[PDB]
Amino acid sequence: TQSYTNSFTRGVYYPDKVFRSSVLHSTQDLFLPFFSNVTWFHAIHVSGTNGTKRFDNPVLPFNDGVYFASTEKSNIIRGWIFGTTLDSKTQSLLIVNNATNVVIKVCEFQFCNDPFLDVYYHKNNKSWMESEFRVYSSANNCTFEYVSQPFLMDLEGKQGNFKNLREFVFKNIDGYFKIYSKHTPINLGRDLPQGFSALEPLVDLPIGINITRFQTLLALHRSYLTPGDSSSGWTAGAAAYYVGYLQPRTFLLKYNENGTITDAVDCALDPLS
């Protein structure tokens, strides 16, 4: 279960921490190229009576930072795990987002078997979900605990047709792990809206390890509204779980009179650009 789509003008953030207004700034950094293609991975739960395997948590290359977008009203997505081997021989991050906290632990966790999963996995009759996640086993030699405020909140969705698109970008430069984020309340029917909404800086950490793989700690205990298909290659579907890769591009940003970013032009897409 995987498809493709087009990311029109999404994935732009503030390069630095200096206020600017009514001016055009030319910058060069790791950005998401305009009109690039982004994959769709869908988490499908099949035959809740039975226990059919899902394979809903693929491992992705993480080549020079990644862009992430999710459109879910619930808190089904909970954290992302990074690392080069995800074994006991190497050190792996454990960014985990529970109800009101974020625990970041860089360590050499022995194993990450799987999230807890009920055999029925049915949420049409039951709704409560209490303390049913435990992924690791041991932690021998490590530091850098960062218990802090939750990164992603939950905006209220009312009257239907109102969902919040959550966008994140993670990068690693000279042993520093940078995370930017933005939660756009307005997407409506369009799967990936076309427009501009800059990402504000969120967190910078001194991790200092190599990262060549990552995946998600998706709580596969239950999941609704997850249609399935056998499509592959250049096809279409529905996933509500996006991902894309950054490249070292040069952009030209236009700053509004109020200090916000209104428009941007890529300097490597077309001859006219």
Binding site: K17, V18, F19, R20, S21, V23, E200, N258, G259
Partner: protein, 49 residues
Amino acid sequence: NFNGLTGTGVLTESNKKFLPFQQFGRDIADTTDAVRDPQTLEILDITPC
């Protein structure tokens, strides 16, 4: 002398909408024009003599 960045000029109350992660303000030619007070969360505008 705001947090180690010296200068010279008159300071006035400013009406620029900063952001929580933004402290300094610049312009063309890359010179400081607006500063955020360290002790109190206030925005000041610098004008030369």
